[PDB]
Amino acid sequence: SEFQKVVVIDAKGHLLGRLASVVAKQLLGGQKVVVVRCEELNISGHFFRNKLKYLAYLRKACRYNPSRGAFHFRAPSRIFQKAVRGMLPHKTARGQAALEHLQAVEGIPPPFDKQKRVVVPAALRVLRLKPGRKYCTVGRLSSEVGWKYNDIVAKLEERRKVKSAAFYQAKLAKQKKIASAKEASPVNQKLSQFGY
Amino acid sequence: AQGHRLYVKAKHLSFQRSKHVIHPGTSIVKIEGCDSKEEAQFYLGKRVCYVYKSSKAVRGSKIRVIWGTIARPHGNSGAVRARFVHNLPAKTFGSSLRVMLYPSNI
Amino acid sequence: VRYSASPALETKCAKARGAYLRTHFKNSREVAFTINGMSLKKAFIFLDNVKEHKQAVPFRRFNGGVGRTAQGKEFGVTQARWPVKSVKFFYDLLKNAEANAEAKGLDMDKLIIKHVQVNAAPKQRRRTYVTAYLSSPSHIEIIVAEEEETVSRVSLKQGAKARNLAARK
Amino acid sequence: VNIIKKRTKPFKRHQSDRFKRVGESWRKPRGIDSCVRRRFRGTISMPKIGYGNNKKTRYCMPNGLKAFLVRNVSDVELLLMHNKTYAAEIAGNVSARKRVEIVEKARALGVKVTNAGA
Amino acid sequence: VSLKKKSKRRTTRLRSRIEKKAAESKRKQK
Amino acid sequence: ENVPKKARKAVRPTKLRASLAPGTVCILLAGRFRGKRVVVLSQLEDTLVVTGPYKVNGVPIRRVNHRYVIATSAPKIDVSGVSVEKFTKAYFAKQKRSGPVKKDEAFFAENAPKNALPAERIADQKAVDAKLLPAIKAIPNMKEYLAASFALSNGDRPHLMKF
RNA sequence: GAAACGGAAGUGUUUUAUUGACUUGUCCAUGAAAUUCCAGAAUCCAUUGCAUACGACUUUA
RNA sequence: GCGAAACCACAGCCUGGGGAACGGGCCAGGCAAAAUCAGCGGGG
RNA sequence: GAAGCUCAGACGAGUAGGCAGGCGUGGAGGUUUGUGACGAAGCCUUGGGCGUGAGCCUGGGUCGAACAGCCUCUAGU
RNA sequence: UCUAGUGGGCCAUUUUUGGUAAGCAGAACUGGCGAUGCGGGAUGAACCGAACGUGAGGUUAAGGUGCCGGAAUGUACGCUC
RNA sequence: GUACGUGAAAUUGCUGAAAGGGAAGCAUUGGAAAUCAG
């Protein structure tokens, strides 16, 4: 709980509204936020109801120049951005600057796949939803509302998980070597009465 | 590289305000690490400083500082109220303040 | 007579004035704004070219209803015209300004239009069959000149540290 | 004792920032339903008797001496017994000859002048 | 999204008219 | 020439914090020596007449206000073996500036420890160090602790840590 | 100075080599201070008619 | 090249609400990037 | 400035209406050994000061022949 | 004793009779509005607080503490897909 | 300089500074630049 320049949030298993509210409060506090893996955000309510909610959202359009009408964004990252910006005073310079401090992406791009990704417990579905309750996935609602990049993200995420697993195995082996040398070192038992 | 920072970090959140009225005479400050009013009791009376930089060189320095003092806690989540010698600008919302450890009471 | 600007000094400048000219104030302003800052020879080539319809005067401010053209692309705008009467007047004043510069004894090669301005003149009443066909004459003057281009204190603490740093150095 | 001003911004007549035929001098609104007279939010304040300053410091300049208008050497001499509380201010129509004569008279009096260097 | 055909929010005449005519209903049943 | 009223405000001695007993290791929170650790020789009327062992961290005999001092739970260093009554407010008095007509690089060359600083003051400081070093040499880690400097880091909460 | 790897926005990663450094690992000696109570191109002119109210466009030059 | 007039508190996007008169100013949203040209007349 | 000084307490929306005290303009009588070609009035000003306010003084620039404070009177204020 | 301005109307309250698919109409009192700014109810002539000199500090009313929005994504027990 | 005492405002041109995504104006607090003052 210390002020970092950039917080990378792995949005897997989170709730859209709860994560948006927490992020919107951090941006007004003046913190750069990168919400990666937005195709895994969870929304309460069963999938058919959520798709009806979204398909009702498409209905809002101008009767003159739908080019000026409401802009319906189908990407899961843009869905999260719409949720976040609705919780911000974006009509003012403060809120407009706050939006510039948020980077919502699909998947985990290489500039952010090699950085620690914290999670928000106040938005996690496992901790915040009663078991036995129906929910949906934004990355699934997006595919059946118009989003057309689901397959590429899934493929590029399988590659990323494979590479990350290889990296962790190498780091775990090095950590095992360091861990083995730990008790071999003597001061770790000689004067460890301080609790370390 | 790490032998300094005798201060703790803070953010200038907003003016002490109602829904439609703001009072710039006192500001709201969120100290890093402080998460309750009883913890804010320690930081009461400490000297908070707002450090910014400007273009024109005065006294051979780019850095200007505005002093302040933590007065009372604000809410339950650890935020406090701060009073400065000059009221902080409204464009510093979310900027970083440095709460020093003096005047110490321990 | 005193002009709108501090220059017209004898050091580098030459003066020219025309008052109560039967030229439109809006067109005169466009020509003056275009030629301001140009070299004297470059201005002569420009005005001759505007006369011959090879380049055009961009209409920046008074651009209501002005047609578009390709000849304005050299100024980054689309509305340009060829006001010949304003060009004739400006050419005459520029010739007079050059003659005054030669009389003063300036270097003709470095001369540029430092300050050119157009002001409205007393309106002239004429009748229309009832309403008025008011004329808008212009006062134009030209100034051509050859182109030419920390005491902070230290506190006791500040200087003592600075002296200590110098001693370490 | 020090000097305290309750307000520094002067009261501008309503809509004097919108019209030039309307002067900057304060005029009390008379309309029954006008927002200024009914004193709604975010409206320019009206001159109130509560806005007055401390009597012990009222009319006093920042240095504490009340300015007294002076035209001739006689007016300078009248501030002999009040030099600690009044400061001579030279009238704007006093010629250069009387100005230098007056200013040295005040300097010999030990009376402060608020427009001496002019 | 509302996800409704009829808005759940009410107009000020409509909300005021309930207290107008709900009280009269109690007057009538009395 | 009005006579002001007799103020009924009398001067009474300071009640210092009980934790600031002489012989305690403390951190400077301000000044040129911020973060340094020092041994409190005694308590003056308002401030603390304190010095870090100059042969250890090079902190001379200085006063520090008790509100800019972090008292530690580090074991006490004996100071009873050295006199402290020679440290007075008049002893620490910074004479008088007597006009700001100075600082033309001459007041600053003629300053520093080479000049100004009398050889007598060096004598008391060395005498205090001579009477203090044997104690901190006997008790382990005091020499290294005093030579080091205090600083905060990530995950450090001043309202939670106890010194 | 050379090898490999990293393409999702590769914002970098490993591997070394040669050296120049500093090497708190532990134990000793020197100086700090009066900072004596916080601060090469394109366009105009010209040309084209696949285009065209004027701009623009498509060609030549 | 010459050269007007009517009109003019200020202006200028839409949706829901603003008890009414819903309006352009207020509330909540969609939105929102200079300067312009020729049309058509919806909105006064 | 007895038309003054001093101590204390309470009080403070305001239309119709009632009462009281002040700012400013033209002219008249009295006074200021009053201001002025070494610059009156007027005018401009991102200068300074005073008063809750009506308003007043002043610095700089321009300008050229008159003008103002105090107590009364008066009004095409 | 005399002397300015006004003698209207809207909203709700409790007492009755005449009433009808259905509202409704006529009385008496009471207050609020009108001469009244301020906090809240997203905003508002009639809803909840509160009657207004210029300021500093403290504390509240009504309403609130996920974000916009100052304030607990507090504690405890249930209901609901 | 006769279009002539003084020469205001509306309005206009130039220069310098600054701001500008479907209003602009104003008020409160403070920063930034400029300026004056004790």
Side-chain angles (χ1 to χ4, degrees):
Chain A
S1 162
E2 62 87 20
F3 303 150
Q4 328 187 9
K5 73 211 330 285
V6 179
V7 159
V8 187
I9 300 152
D10 173 51
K12 190 258 292 177
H14 290 81
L15 293 163
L16 173 84
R18 307 299 178 94
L19 184 49
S21 161
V22 177
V23 167
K25 197 48 175 147
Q26 299 313 310
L27 300 175
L28 294 171
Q31 185 145 11
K32 164 83 181 203
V33 176
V34 180
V35 176
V36 296
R37 208 198 297 191
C38 284
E39 40 278 5
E40 301 295 81
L41 273 163
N42 283 132
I43 302 169
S44 50
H46 64 117
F47 175 69
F48 198 117
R49 190 182 146 77
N50 283 271
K51 182 177 74 179
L52 283 181
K53 273 207 287 213
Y54 198 148
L55 279 176
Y57 166 56
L58 279 72
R59 199 188 330 278
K60 327 282 184 286
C62 274
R63 292 295 90 192
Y64 64 93
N65 260 324
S67 306
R68 306 207 276 219
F71 303 160
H72 314 110
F73 277 89
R74 274 96 160 178
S77 67
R78 298 314 297 256
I79 282 156
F80 181 70
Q81 293 187 23
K82 180 208 178 307
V84 168
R85 70 178 274 276
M87 311 197 173
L88 288 151
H90 64 259
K91 290 292 182 73
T92 51
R94 189 172 86 115
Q96 188 64 34
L99 226 38
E100 182 47 47
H101 279 136
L102 175 78
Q103 190 62 46
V105 305
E106 293 85 2
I108 309 174
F112 299 128
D113 69 2
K114 285 140 61 73
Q115 320 200 312
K116 183 70 167 68
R117 302 177 279 272
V118 317
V119 304
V120 185
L124 275 161
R125 177 194 36 91
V126 56
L127 296 206
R128 287 288 322 176
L129 214 64
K130 180 182 298 292
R133 281 289 187 262
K134 281 302 303 295
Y135 67 69
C136 81
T137 310
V138 190
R140 162 148 166 72
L141 158 65
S142 295
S143 51
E144 293 78 325
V145 66
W147 192 51
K148 64 180 77 170
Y149 289 147
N150 174 57
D151 313 278
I152 318 294
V153 177
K155 168 171 62 184
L156 285 166
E157 217 64 25
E158 301 308 318
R159 299 187 216 215
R160 185 198 71 75
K161 291 181 185 182
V162 163
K163 296 203 293 174
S164 191
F167 160 79
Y168 164 90
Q169 281 295 327
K171 171 165 141 237
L172 189 52
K174 187 257 286 183
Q175 191 65 251
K176 182 62 66 68
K177 296 281 298 302
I178 297 276
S180 49
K182 190 66 63 66
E183 62 295 9
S185 337
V187 75
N188 164 323
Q189 288 72 244
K190 292 206 296 285
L191 301 62
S192 178
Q193 71 274 10
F194 301 124
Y196 287 74
Chain B
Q2 64 183 177
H4 316 93
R5 187 171 90 73
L6 281 103
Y7 59 93
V8 72
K9 337 203 161 283
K11 311 298 282 183
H12 179 217
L13 283 191
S14 65
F15 290 145
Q16 182 251 346
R17 66 174 290 167
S18 73
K19 201 187 292 187
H20 296 298
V21 185
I22 54 132
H23 292 76
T26 165
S27 309
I28 280 157
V29 169
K30 180 67 173 66
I31 296 92
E32 181 256 349
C34 186
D35 286 330
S36 68
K37 43 188 205 291
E38 328 77 50
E39 294 196 357
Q41 286 300 316
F42 172 79
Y43 301 106
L44 294 175
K46 301 287 179 287
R47 186 97 172 271
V48 64
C49 68
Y50 174 57
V51 165
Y52 57 108
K53 69 180 72 72
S54 81
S55 63
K56 204 192 71 83
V58 65
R59 300 195 64 78
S61 173
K62 300 288 95 175
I63 291 284
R64 327 210 190 176
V65 189
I66 287 184
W67 303 114
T69 278
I70 297 89
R72 55 198 264 158
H74 193 81
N76 304 297
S77 308
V80 308
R81 305 200 201 173
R83 253 194 277 286
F84 290 73
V85 299
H86 304 317
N87 291 318
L88 291 176
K91 63 102 173 182
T92 73
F93 282 174
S95 280
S96 297
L97 279 44
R98 301 144 68 138
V99 179
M100 271 85 78
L101 296 175
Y102 59 85
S104 72
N105 314 327
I106 187 164
Chain C
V1 191
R2 46 185 62 219
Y3 286 26
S4 297
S6 181
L9 281 75
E10 77 277 24
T11 63
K12 305 189 302 180
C13 309
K15 308 167 68 66
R17 148 179 289 116
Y20 310 102
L21 314 174
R22 284 182 200 201
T23 188
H24 281 179
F25 168 67
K26 314 205 152 154
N27 303 341
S28 314
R29 188 267 182 190
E30 300 308 328
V31 187
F33 194 49
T34 301
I35 66 171
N36 200 5
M38 290 213 198
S39 158
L40 189 55
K41 293 174 177 59
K42 184 178 184 293
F44 277 147
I45 307 330
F46 179 75
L47 292 170
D48 203 348
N49 264 297
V50 180
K51 276 185 180 181
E52 301 305 8
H53 264 272
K54 309 284 173 279
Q55 335 206 54
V57 175
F59 272 35
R60 259 84 179 273
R61 176 180 286 153
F62 309 102
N63 55 352
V66 185
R68 306 190 292 222
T69 183
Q71 297 195 16
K73 289 203 298 323
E74 81 186 60
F75 307 110
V77 289
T78 43
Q79 282 160 295
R81 264 195 189 168
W82 300 264
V84 297
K85 276 190 64 72
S86 301
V87 164
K88 288 161 162 57
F89 277 111
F90 270 96
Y91 194 110
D92 289 21
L93 278 70
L94 277 181
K95 280 284 199 68
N96 174 236
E98 181 185 2
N100 305 351
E102 301 315 346
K104 266 200 185 189
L106 294 174
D107 163 78
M108 65 216 75
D109 307 335
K110 286 175 60 66
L111 294 188
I112 72 158
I113 317 161
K114 183 190 195 303
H115 175 75
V116 63
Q117 194 191 28
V118 181
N119 290 318
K123 287 184 284 182
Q124 290 167 30
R125 284 281 151 71
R126 199 201 306 171
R127 184 141 81 200
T128 298
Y129 306 101
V130 73
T131 195
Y133 268 173
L134 274 161
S135 294
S136 65
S138 307
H139 300 308
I140 305 173
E141 81 275 339
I142 286 176
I143 294 306
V144 295
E146 69 274 15
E147 187 291 331
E148 191 46 287
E149 192 275 331
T150 300
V151 180
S152 178
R153 288 297 101 185
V154 286
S155 85
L156 163 154
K157 221 199 286 174
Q158 268 160 350
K161 179 174 173 62
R163 182 261 298 161
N164 279 30
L165 185 61
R168 303 182 201 277
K169 294 293 291 295
Chain D
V1 73
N2 63 316
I3 304 299
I4 300 198
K5 297 295 192 292
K6 290 200 177 143
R7 183 178 160 103
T8 69
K9 278 90 187 173
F11 301 86
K12 306 294 175 183
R13 176 173 166 167
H14 186 51
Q15 275 149 300
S16 66
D17 322 298
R18 271 104 208 150
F19 290 107
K20 200 164 185 305
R21 77 213 187 209
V22 164
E24 301 266 330
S25 282
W26 168 247
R27 290 297 172 288
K28 168 78 161 291
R30 294 291 201 250
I32 194 70
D33 72 336
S34 69
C35 279
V36 181
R37 188 194 75 88
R38 279 148 76 90
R39 190 203 334 279
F40 284 107
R41 288 151 68 184
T43 313
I44 48 146
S45 296
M46 275 147 66
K48 289 167 182 177
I49 202 70
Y51 266 107
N53 320 283
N54 191 321
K55 300 201 275 284
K56 309 207 175 201
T57 55
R58 204 181 141 161
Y59 298 107
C60 280
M61 301 215 318
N63 51 29
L65 299 85
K66 296 165 229 294
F68 179 67
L69 192 57
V70 163
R71 304 161 210 290
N72 48 2
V73 169
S74 304
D75 291 331
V76 188
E77 271 156 40
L78 280 276
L79 294 175
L80 180 174
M81 45 306 301
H82 307 289
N83 45 358
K84 289 294 174 296
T85 176
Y86 280 56
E89 174 168 304
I90 315 302
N93 45 357
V94 180
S95 56
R97 314 155 87 190
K98 282 216 212 301
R99 272 196 77 104
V100 291
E101 191 46 31
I102 278 175
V103 72
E104 62 76 20
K105 183 70 179 180
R107 164 211 71 81
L109 268 274
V111 173
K112 204 152 301 303
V113 182
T114 65
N115 46 3
Chain E
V1 186
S2 66
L3 208 57
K4 304 292 311 273
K5 299 185 291 293
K6 187 255 292 174
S7 167
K8 294 207 283 279
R9 99 183 194 196
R10 286 189 270 175
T11 62
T12 73
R13 44 180 290 101
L14 161 63
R15 69 176 181 176
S16 66
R17 187 123 206 207
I18 329 297
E19 290 56 72
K20 298 292 183 182
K21 64 91 175 179
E24 184 173 38
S25 80
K26 324 322 311 183
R27 300 289 220 202
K28 186 171 286 293
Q29 58 79 19
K30 174 257 289 178
Chain F
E1 182 65 26
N2 214 217
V3 176
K5 212 173 294 292
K6 277 74 69 177
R8 289 180 186 186
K9 307 304 172 190
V11 176
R12 293 172 215 91
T14 325
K15 187 258 184 184
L16 276 298
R17 311 207 291 278
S19 303
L20 298 177
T24 301
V25 193
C26 299
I27 297 90
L28 268 68
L29 294 179
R32 70 174 301 164
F33 297 143
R34 60 182 78 239
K36 296 281 190 178
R37 298 175 175 97
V38 291
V39 166
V40 184
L41 309 188
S42 78
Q43 320 199 46
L44 198 57
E45 86 199 345
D46 193 358
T47 88
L48 298 174
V49 181
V50 69
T51 181
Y54 195 88
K55 298 199 298 292
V56 175
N57 51 35
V59 176
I61 297 285
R62 297 169 60 79
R63 296 182 303 172
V64 59
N65 193 271
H66 64 303
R67 287 302 178 99
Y68 299 69
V69 164
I70 272 296
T72 56
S73 88
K76 254 75 180 171
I77 310 327
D78 174 339
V79 181
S80 63
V82 66
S83 166
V84 297
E85 271 315 329
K86 64 167 66 65
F87 309 97
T88 88
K89 188 183 174 190
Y91 172 85
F92 285 108
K94 189 179 170 63
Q95 52 96 33
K96 184 60 175 65
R97 323 172 51 83
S98 296
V101 57
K102 278 174 183 177
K103 278 198 267 153
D104 61 357
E105 292 84 4
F107 181 76
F108 274 20
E110 179 260 332
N111 246 339
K114 293 297 97 173
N115 320 341
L117 184 64
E120 163 295 335
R121 159 77 75 88
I122 309 172
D124 322 67
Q125 163 84 20
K126 193 181 287 187
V128 176
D129 296 337
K131 288 172 169 302
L132 276 180
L133 267 292
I136 87 185
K137 243 62 181 170
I139 164 175
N141 268 322
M142 271 305 118
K143 56 181 178 292
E144 181 145 40
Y145 187 74
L146 266 54
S149 296
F150 177 76
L152 283 182
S153 50
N154 304 7
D156 263 38
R157 305 163 74 155
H159 61 289
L160 286 201
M161 48 185 49
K162 35 183 173 287
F163 308 85

